[PDB]
Symmetry: C3
Subunit: 406 residues, 3 copies
């Protein structure tokens, strides 16, 4: 029948039950807790393995698919929508976190421009650049971690160039089309192992909770993120959809119910891409030419909930450490969180590796992620839902704004 | 005429003569000894350069060549034979080494599963993952050394996916076919320099022998390995060949005499692949469709003598250090040695870099390889012979077991 | 109209004016000086990003374009001319620097052979090998920095192999042709940002001059380099051109005036390749089949002024530190400087990273590059001009020596 989401629902309920029963009926040491969540670790190792070919091939094929005369218009209509919706999300998150109050920046601002143009393509696949001043002179070095931001820019430029070359460069277009669909097939292969991995990934996640006092203390912060996500998903996005196209926005969401449920269960926007494609094309009746570009490109660039969570978490951690923020310190968080959303891949544990940059932007230690790591999975489950909903709503907007070219 | 093996025989006899005459008539320092064996070092740098494209392209083309309906059957018939023959070799080696007696394991057991699914494809080409516990919590880091095990798994999955896609993904099949045959051409180019490199590689190998007391002390251990190789090559493999196909097993070996001699002289199963192909196809009259898959895939996965040597050497080093082994400690050696055979490339100095993992599995320092490094080349010369003989015997077995599909 | 060089001339004059006016009218700290030259840093990050695909694809396509029967002859006629002209340049530089007098080698000599055959293709793209002796035994390790020398050799061998395979390996030829022209398109895209980057790259270069006493002290050394470049560009190259082909050498230079001006303004031989192509083909009326091979291959291998500058700077730094040089110490500089010219890419700051090897060849600290870093841009501007002039003159020589095969 349809085991794609039934198996995942069974896995998540079994994971919750197993974690609760084990944590209570037993007292395991930290080493045994680490050994317990090994299958989830293997699932995460596979998901992180698949991202690089996925991102590179998806960007290249999405940009090169557009004809030379329409690449500018459709690309602009997509990028403007992405930037506007993410800025709205960041502003809403900052405003809400400031109102509720749950609790060397230039170097980090220039490091973002330095990482858009890496010095080496091979090294950018597994290493990232960072500079720190010392005596005052600037010293730069390469740390570990894939440089998604530079690879995305290079892939966009390469796709545009190959699309402009035409029949002479058609061989590269064919090569990257085949590579992208091979990567999609490999992701479909991983979806078989996904449920058993998710079971342990959540069971061992609800086991490390030492006393629930962490859950009580992280209260109010969790409400701020959930309220921001609800406002951005139920109010702002349907409103901007209705403004562009005069259609009932909620019928679109109801048609994208399967994709939303899959995203909320697996917490990965890149692995739910086929379901989103099917729901958008077969049900909502969206043109293929534009969705084939909006979906794969926006599955890792357009992440509104991720940006909102980055801004809210950064300001909350700052408030936990005092360090009253000025107006200028608000802005550097807003811009960095926008880059952090673009710099994170469609995998669960993403959004924590990219939060180090936004934390160091305002001069904070990298170890403060542990202040909120405890309950991050529950918020990730809801971040992914709005990350894919934004992509779906962008699809209808671009389609309505591209009627004259179809 | 036929200079492929005549030149190699001349090179090996000249190397033995040169090493003996130099070591005796002269007293060189360690720096001069290092400078003496420079051409062998260059040959090894070239052979290690060629392995990565060779392995990747060979696995991809071998798996994608099979049709979608026959890929499962032939692949299963090959992998079952590989696993069974290697397990037999490991068991025989362990039994012999235990009888003759010449003299934190869970982390190393899970590192093997962690290395089958690397977190990065580019980083897996030159780096490997390892975890060590410290206070107890697990800390992981990436050391140097190509991750052959993860690349093999990814290449197998990619080849299966591309074979299933068909005419749409035929461009990748063509690309990797061309890449594989280009790599074979480059290996044929290196075969010109091979003889002069081998001359110094053995001359400087028989020079570092300080007093022959090392040869006397390593006695009994060398007998255990040679007896195990002889038993596995003369008895077990012909018997399992005769059981499957009712033909004289020794006629097959006699037809593969040129390949066996080349493997025994150059000590590299990947560089003797064309000779093995020629001997199996032109003389033994083996079908091309199945040999084109069994030979290149099995030239680095199917290594029986390597696994036997790993097990015997690990147990011998353990006995030199006391540390009486339990039944459980025998098993972790057996499984790790099976992975070590798969994880080693078809190059001479391989089998020593992969022995560090099997030594650390039972909690031993990485510097104990020096206890047997002195006479390792002589045992490598015989390991390669049985490594290629196992591949040849597997070819006839799979062919006889694949008559109905040809 | 023609904004390619008018904009660059405006940028260079504005950069000189801005640097002079700022350095005098203001007293900035070192951190502010570093922040001032940020756009030049971004331009350099982009230029260093583009070199690896450019080099690999250019070598592969240039070698594979030649037919199997003519690849040996044309390749030999090009490589002999390259080696002879570079040796002449090195000898002239050494002679001039010795006459004017402005002021563990075996390990560094064998490291060059070790770097021609790297142990890993992926690691060679961003790392380089070096050995140092310690107690005496040799210990080797990998430092950072792209290994251009090994990649060039592998690309040459791969191109020859693919050209010999023919229609069977034509898919790789097509792939690399498309990749090379895509890289050229990306370089043309970077040429838009080039002028604004050059403005700051020179403005902040003439700002770090502390007191002009450095300019006075570096006098005589600058004259030695300029005189060597003038002699090699005005006398030796036209003479060797006239000897081969009985045509007026200076008419060729006058036709290559646009390319020479572009090279002198942007100080990058790889980014001025399209202009050199246009000037050589449309004006000088050179056959396309031979220029398509001589230009892209020689744009990074044939660098005469770079080698002359390396030799002169190394001997000048040695004379600043006393350390009287023997005849043997002259030779190791000459051979290393020849490799340093081949090992440097067509980017401005190149020639300083490759000078560390030639400085360590004679046993000198790597920090002595700061003795001449102050005025290096002015000498680079003239190095690039002769680097492209040598390529142009080689084109006519090979064409005249290849009449019978066209
Ligand atoms: N879960 C996100 C990745 C980024 C994040 O978790 O913050 C997604 O797949 O859309
Ligand atoms: N000599 C082996 C490689 C592995 C080893 O030496 O143990 C072969 O080429 O088959
Ligand atoms: N500027 C040189 C690069 C090498 C050097 O600067 O020494 C060129 O592009 O030709
Ligand atoms: Hg969780
Ligand atoms: Hg040996
Ligand atoms: Hg300058
Ligand atoms: Na967005
Ligand atoms: Na998304
Ligand atoms: Na992202
Ligand atoms: Na085996
Ligand atoms: Na083998
Ligand atoms: Na192996
Ligand atoms: Na030259
Ligand atoms: Na040049
Ligand atoms: Na060069």
């Amino acid at each position: 029948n349809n085991w794609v989401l039934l198996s995942t629902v069974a896995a998540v309920v079994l994971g919750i039950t197993t974690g609760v029963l084990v944590r209570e009926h037993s007292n395991l040491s930290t080493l045994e807790k680490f050994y317990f969540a090994f299958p989830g670790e293997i699932l995460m190792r596979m998901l992180k393995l698949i991202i690089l070919p996925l991102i590179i091939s998806s960007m290249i094929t999405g940009v090169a698919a557009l004809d030379s005369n329409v690449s500018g218009k459709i690309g602009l209509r997509a990028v403007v929508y992405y930037f506007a919706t993410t800025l709205i999300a960041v502003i809403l998150g900052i405003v809400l976190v400031v109102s509720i109050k749950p609790g060397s920046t230039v170097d980090a601002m220039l490091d973002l421009i330095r990482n858009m143009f890496p010095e080496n393509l091979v090294q950018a696949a597994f290493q990232q650049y960072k500079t720190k001043r010392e005596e005052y002179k600037i010293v730069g070095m390469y740390s570990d971690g894939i440089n998604v931001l530079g690879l995305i820019v290079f892939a966009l430029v390469f796709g545009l160039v190959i699309g402009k070359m035409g029949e002479k460069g058609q061989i590269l277009v064919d090569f990257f089309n085949a590579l992208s669909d091979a990567t999609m097939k490999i992701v479909q292969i991983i979806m078989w192992y996904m449920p058993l991995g998710i079971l342990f990934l959540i069971a061992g996640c609800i086991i490390e909770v030492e006393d629930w006092e962490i859950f009580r203390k992280l209260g109010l912060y969790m409400a701020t993120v959930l309220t921001g996500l609800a406002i951005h998903s139920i109010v702002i996005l349907p409103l901007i959809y209705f403004i562009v196209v005069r259609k009932n926005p909620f019928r679109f969401a109801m048609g994208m119910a399967q994709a939303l449920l899959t995203a909320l269960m697996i917490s990965s926007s890149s692995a739910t891409l086929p379901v989103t494609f099917r729901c958008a094309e077969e049900n909502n009746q969206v043109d293929k030419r534009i969705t084939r570009f909006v979906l794969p490109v926006g599955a890792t660039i357009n992440m509104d909930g991720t940006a909102l969570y980055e801004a809210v978490a950064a300001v909350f951690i700052a408030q936990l450490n005092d360090l009253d923020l000025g107006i200028g310190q608000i802005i550097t968080i807003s811009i960095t969180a926008t880059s952090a959303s673009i710099g994170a891949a469609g995998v669960p544990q993403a959004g924590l590796v990219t939060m180090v940059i936004v934390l160091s932007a305002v001069g904070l230690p990298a170890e403060d992620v542990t202040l909120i790591i405890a309950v991050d999975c529950l918020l990730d489950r809801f971040r992914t839902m709005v990350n894919v909903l934004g992509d779906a709503f962008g699809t209808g907007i671009v389609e309505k704004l591209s009627k004259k070219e179809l």
